[PDB]
Each structure stands twice: as C-alpha cells, then as structure tokens.
Amino acid sequence: ETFKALKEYRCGQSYDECEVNQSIYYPNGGDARKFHSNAKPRAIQIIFSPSVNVRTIKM
Amino acid sequence: RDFAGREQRLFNSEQYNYNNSLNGEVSVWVYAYYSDGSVLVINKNSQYKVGISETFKALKEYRCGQSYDECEVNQSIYYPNGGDARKFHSNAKPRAIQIIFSPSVNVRTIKMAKGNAVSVPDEYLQRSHPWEATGIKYRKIKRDGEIVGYSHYFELPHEYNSISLAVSGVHKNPSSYNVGCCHNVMDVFQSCDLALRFCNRYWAELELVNHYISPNAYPYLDINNHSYGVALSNRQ
Amino acid sequence: RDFAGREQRLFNSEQYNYNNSLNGEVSVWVYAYYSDGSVLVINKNSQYKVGISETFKALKEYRCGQSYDECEVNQSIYYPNGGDARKFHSNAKPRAIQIIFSPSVNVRTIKMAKGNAVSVPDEYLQRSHPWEATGIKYRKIKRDGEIVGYSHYFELPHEYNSISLAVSGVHKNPSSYNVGCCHNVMDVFQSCDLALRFCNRYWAELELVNHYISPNAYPYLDINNHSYGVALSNRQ
Amino acid sequence: RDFAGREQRLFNSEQYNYNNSLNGEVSVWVYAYYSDGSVLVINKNSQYKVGISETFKALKEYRCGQSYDECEVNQSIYYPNGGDARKFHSNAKPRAIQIIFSPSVNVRTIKMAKGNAVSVPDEYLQRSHPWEATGIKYRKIKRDGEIVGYSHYFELPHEYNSISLAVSGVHKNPSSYNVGCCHNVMDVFQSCDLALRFCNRYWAELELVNHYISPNAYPYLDINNHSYGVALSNRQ
C-alpha cells in the first residue's frame, strides 16, 4: 500500500487532506490547515496465518 | 592521507554500485503531462524487475478536492459517437508521456504495451504482439558524464492519441546467475508483492522538479531538455 | 551618570512591581491540546481574583468555517451507550490541559474544580468538595532566574478522561488590607464585571508561541519543557 | 457486631451531611419543556450560593445537527408586529418550566427574576423589584420520607407567556458564621469562578429520567407527579 492508501477514509462521510499529503512528501510543500492529520495511522499490526514460513517473511 | 576525502568518494561509489547489484532497486516512472501544465507521476520501485500498467481512464487528469461529463467523454473515446459529452476535446487527456528508468535497468529488457483506449496493443487482439522493445529509443540522462537515468518521451498531440499504457524493465545482471531460476524464483515472486508504488499530481513542472525529483535524488529530463540527477560513481 | 540605563531598569522594574500591586492584573490561561496539534486558549484578566469555568462540550475542538455526530458523541459520554455516535473516540476531545497563572497570583489560593462530563466535581454531588487546592503542583516558569508564571500540566490520555473544568486564583496581597472587606467589597464586585476574556484556537503550538505568547509578553511552557516569558525585575 | 451494616449506614449518612455542610455543594436545575416532548436542562453546582440566568432566546428549543424564521419570531415577540415571521406560534418556545434545588439550599433564600422577552422583571425597569422570593411555592420532593429536593413548576400555556428567567439560592447555614463576611468573602468570590455548569437537550422525559436524573442520583419530579432521587440520611 501507498502512504495515501493507509490513511483513514470514512465512506459516506478531502481538499485539506490532499494538501496534508503534499506537506508530508516534502516539508512545507503543501497548503494544509492542520499540523497533524488524524487520518494518519498511529500503529500497524501484521498478522500471518500459521501456514506461513516465518523465515520467509519480508517487509 | 585525506581519509575524509577517500571515505566521501567511497560512500558515493558504494551507493552507485549497490543500486546496480542484484540486491538493489530498479525503478520506473511514468509522467503524464496535461494542457494545464500539471504533471501526474506514477513510480514503482522493486527488486529484479519492475513495471507500471494503467488504463486510459487512469491516465486522465484528476484534481483531488476540486465527472458525469468526463464519464461520457470516455464512452465517446471507446467508440466513436458512443457518448453524450458536451466537449470536443477533454483537457483531462494527457498531451505527452515521459518514461524514465533508473540507471540500474538493462535497457535491452525494456518493453512497452501502448494500447488503444479499450486496452488492445495493436488494433485487434488477434493481431497484437503484446509489447514492443523500445530500448533503442531511450536517451541517456547524464550529469557530469554519468548516466543517471534513461528517458523515452512521446507526445500525443492529435485528437486520436487516446491510450492505455504499460511498461516494464529488468534490473541489470551482467552475471550468468539467473535470478528467476529455481534457486531464487520464489524471491522474484515475493518481489512482486514487495514493490512499492507512489503516485501524485504536481501543479507544474517546477513543483515536480523542486519537490519530487530533486529532494529524492531522482533522474529527470524537463521540457527544455535539461537533465537532473546526481552523479555518484567515484565522485565526491 | 548613565541615566538612559538607570531609567531603562526602572521602567522594567516598575512594570514588574505594578502588576504585583493591588492595583494590577491577575491573569489565568487554560490551554487545551488536541490530537491534530491545534491548541485552544482561554484567557481571563482581572483585578483582585480571576478564573475560568468551561463545560465538557466547550473544551472540545471547534474549527470555525470548517456536528450531528459530535452531538451524539456527547450523549454517549454523559451516559455509557447513551448516544448514536459513529466513532469510538472523538478526536475533538482534548488530550491534555495546561493551566498557567501570571506571577501576580498567590499560588496558595489556586483552586481547581475538574469535574466529570456532567459537571460534578467528584462522582456525585452529595460527596463532592467543590474544589481542590492544587498550588503545590504548579511549577515555576522561569526566565533568567525570574519567575514569569506558574504552570500545571496534566494529560488526559485515557478514553475515560472526559472533563468539565474550572480554575481560580487570587492576586497576591502580602499586606493585611483585605480587598474584599467592607471598604473595598463593591470594587471586587465591579471587578467581576470588568474582567476581560479572550479565546482562540491556534493551528499549532508554533503559531501559539509566535503569535499569542511572544507578542504579548506572556509566560508559557511548551511540550518540550521550554520556558517562555520576559524577566523584568531590576533588568534592562 | 454487623460492622458492614453500620459502615453502610454511616457512608450514606456522611454523604447526606457533607452536602448540607458549608463545605458542600448547592445545586440548581432549570428544566424547559417543549411541545415536541423534548426537555432542555441547565444545571449549576457551586459552593455557598448558586444560580442560573438565561435570555428569552436561550430558552428556546435548539436541536444540534438539525433559524432565519426563528430570528424574526424573536423580533415579533420583543415588539408586537416587529418581525417578518411565517408562523403564529413558534413550537421552539417552552411550554413549561421546572426549577429544582438540591436539599442543601435554604428555601427561604430562593429568588427568581422572571422577566419579559426584553429582560425586564416587571413591565418597565422603573417599577421593577429585581426579584421575587418564591420559596413558599416550592414543593418538597420526597423519597422514603426524606426531602431529596425542592421543586417549582409553572406552565407557560398562553401565547403571551414569553420569558427571560434567572433564579438563585443560598446554601443552608444554620450557624451564625457568615460565609460572606471578611474572613471568607474572597472564597465566595472564588466560588463564582469555580461553579460548574452543564446543559443538554433530551429527546423525551424518559431519556432525561433514565440517562440524566437517575445515573447521577439527582432529584426530579415528573409530569405525572412522580418523585425521583435517593434518600441517604441514616439509610442503608
């Protein structure tokens, strides 16, 4: 996934968040009205099924 | 005895050489140029081999935060007079494309499928070879006598230039070790999963050079034929 | 014989001392910190004594020019499962609070009522003392060895930290003259009417420091524990 | 020898008695009842004395997340035929009011200023006493023979019942210690700053009883004359 694809999207509920992205790709590159976008993930968890071979996992 | 000097030159040379090793990246970028002066970039970075494939509709200009008519434009491009569009020429169609590869590609492996608007490489499927080997057309992007990238640039200036596009290249490998043979083939399959994609639309080529090409040390060739990138081999 | 020097030092000392006199201001600020990095400030400035009191709803983030769901969030915070909200945690809830007093406060008079979301100080009214004397928790904000303000900072990092908040302090008075006794009591009642309030939401702590704290010569303690303010007593 | 029993009775009695001490809360609630069956509650909780004051406009129904016409309604209520409203009777006007005090009030100190729509207590300012002492009208809200609160209920069923409203009561003090005399007067001034306010609109009296009155152990008297609250003095 891209950076943008991991951000929160609430279907049925954007211009500012486009500029947030621009300001994250390059410092001071965007015209965003916020210091921290709450649509950014705070954490990630990766889970594999027990059928994986753990030694082959790559990130 | 100038060890700072020696280590600076080795640090840059190691970067050059690592990228060109079989442990390093190969990268492709597709730039689509619109009449409003904005530029869409799609980038993919992967080990072993890399490519990008987009539909006609995916290459058209989209300004996030700023559609029914453009849906009908598409219908009228798939089949003549097939849509109910209120415009002769959509300004969301790209006017030109530039394909850039990293210097770690082998240029002889570059392949391009430049289809029509319904995603057929050469008029009808029955007569289509699925790609063309276009490496001979790529120009060297050079800085300080070093090849920093490879460029293919083509205009789509005619009303009939309505395209789907895919491109692919393989990382150089001047060894006789086949990275896709039985010993490593599953690692190539994993590389498909591990490739990282980026896309964004910049309002102007200036913004593209200043905030995308340059900060990332990427190669670029601008509309005035000026080369951008960073030479590293045996350089301080 | 350097009269410019002497007068500069006296001008600053007079400012320090005037503020600490019974003719001077006492000021309180409440800063609420949101997860988007924005900061709401509420300030009150008054003679004799000063305070601020806000409801749970009043402390939540409001971006002017940029609601039904947040109304239901409130209902679900007043009573568990009492609302029809489409979110587990409202990002409009403050994550932290900082209380700052001017150096003219008497720290021993500081009182705080930190209620629950229905404005009850300590679980049920029947068992609530209406305030706590929290002065012992205030840190000195210092510049150049001078106390420029007093700070109490507390996080609300848990889902259950849903608060109403009031704070109050009295201007220092090392005299035995009671400003609230019969000779001056009506002037204290008028001071209630005369207090000036300010509130605003700044997009970042940077903007708060640059455009609110610093231009006004106010004390501040930032999230990196850095002190801001202006030392004036016997200083040029 | 049943110490669990004894301690349970003392725990409840201590709550009853603490609230009635000079260290405890006194609380007032104003309930405004609308024709759609919704109820606005305003609560204030403070030491020593407490009150609420609202304008005519502030008492009208507001459904958050769900105005020009209602602005003109106001104009036509301030002066007859003064507005351009598209309705004879605004359903946002309250139909009734209930004032409830905590049992820690002294009923003889209760005062109410029930003004007209332009906030004048009795027709013209020149002839207005600024309040009426209405304590004799308050009913005891009782549970198990214990007074859990005091209630004044009045309908506004006529088109001309268009009101501004303020109410105030003092915490009981059967001692001869004057809490507002010189030794404690500044603490009463701080209590003004420390009072906590709450307001909310519940869709039905059911929701008000279930999610506001009952969870908080507050007194209430419903439209069927049923009493709610918790008796604590010498009770398990």
Curated annotation (Swiss-Prot), chains B, C, D:
**Protein name, as recorded:** Polyhedrin
Species, as recorded: Bombyx mori cytoplasmic polyhedrosis virus (BmCPV)
Query: What else is noted?
Result: The sequence of strain H is shown.
Keywords attached to this Swiss-Prot or TrEMBL record, sorted alphabetically, are: Glycoprotein, Host cytoplasm, Late protein, Signal, Viral occlusion body
Its function, per the record, reads:
Major component of the virus occlusion bodies, which are large proteinaceous structures (polyhedra), that protect the virus from the outside environment for extended periods until they are ingested by insect larvae.
Q: Does the keyword Zinc apply?
A: no
Q: Per the record, GO CC terms? A: host cell cytoplasm; viral occlusion body
Q: Where is the signal peptide?
A: 1-18
